[PDB]
Amino acid sequence: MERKISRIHLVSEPSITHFLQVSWEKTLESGFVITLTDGHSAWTGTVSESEISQEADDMAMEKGKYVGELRKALLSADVYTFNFSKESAYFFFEKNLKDVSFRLGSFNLEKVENPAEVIRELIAYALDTIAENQAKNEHLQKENERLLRDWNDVQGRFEKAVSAKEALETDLYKRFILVLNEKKTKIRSLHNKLLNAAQEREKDIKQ
Amino acid sequence: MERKISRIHLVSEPSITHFLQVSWEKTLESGFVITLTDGHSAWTGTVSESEISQEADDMAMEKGKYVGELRKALLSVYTFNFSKESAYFFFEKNLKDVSFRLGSFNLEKVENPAEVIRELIAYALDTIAENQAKNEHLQKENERLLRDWNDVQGRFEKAVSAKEALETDLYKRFILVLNEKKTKIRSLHNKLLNA
């Protein structure tokens, strides 16, 4: 059981703002209740599923394509206009295309006996919505803060693993350098002893 | 300028629900406007910074402690009473076995309730809009952070597993380079034994 409360401007009353409350079950296609209020009075109407299917046919539109138009227009490139006569309680809206507009919807609303009850329920629904949202934003704010920390934590854990690797790397190399260079000392020594011996043999050959 | 709209029940009409709207600038301490409505009529009252602190004196409470009680009672066990005939509004606190008047206001019946009710509804819809947007922004950050975390965690896994393969991988190479030095040392010894 869903609902959307939107604010709208009527052509015959550009000064004041009105509110539209549409409520349905599952989909608009199965039918919906529409209520118009100016904060003092309220007008209500119903549209059955069959009424929707028929209106779609009378408008030469594919049903789902028609319900799509209703969504964009009633549940808030697509320009829509709304009209209402307090004297007849007739409510209708048109879609304004280029130089060509057309009746999109028409409802004969009935002035409600209990405006206040209707307005109170509407405001009550809005406040409950504001409430449910805050709870959610708070639950997300904590989850945000938890992740900010959980990242900072592993980030450090990372830097430490990397720093530990570098310290171990240089540490190993340092030991290697020593041993390798000690052998190079031996090689240089033996190398030069061999040259000495070579020059010795050459002296024996020359004299 | 901030505001809070609470749903309340009056003692003399447990049946119907009423709405209390309180608005202010910065802190209630500098004065506030309170509006009561039943969706048809509306009653308003202004409480000046002067009056508030005046009340904090009559009680003998720090202006701070006193404003604190109002925040708990007006911005939402607290009891509310209203007489449509006198427009007098008062609320009390109820503790275990006792209750006491916590405050009151002389409200005045508004001339154009519909205007007030329309502005209240408008505010609620804007709030629902703003809150739904934030719920999206925070919902994505929650996603970014989730990803960013996995990233680094992966880096960690890879880094720790590399510090554990180091000793073993560097030592083999050392053995290789080292063996070469040894072979050269052997051949040189060998050549010195030649002559």
Binding site: - | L176, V177, E180
Partner: peptide
């Protein structure tokens, strides 16, 4: 006589951090 071994490490001149890292990386 050769100056370097099959891996690029000198048989005669001492080495150090920078040079050995080069030799190792060359070993796969």
């Amino acid at each position: 006589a050769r100056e370097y071994d099959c891996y690029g490490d000198s048989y005669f001149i001492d080495t150090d951090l920078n040079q050995l890292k080069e030799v190792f990386s060359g070993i796969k």
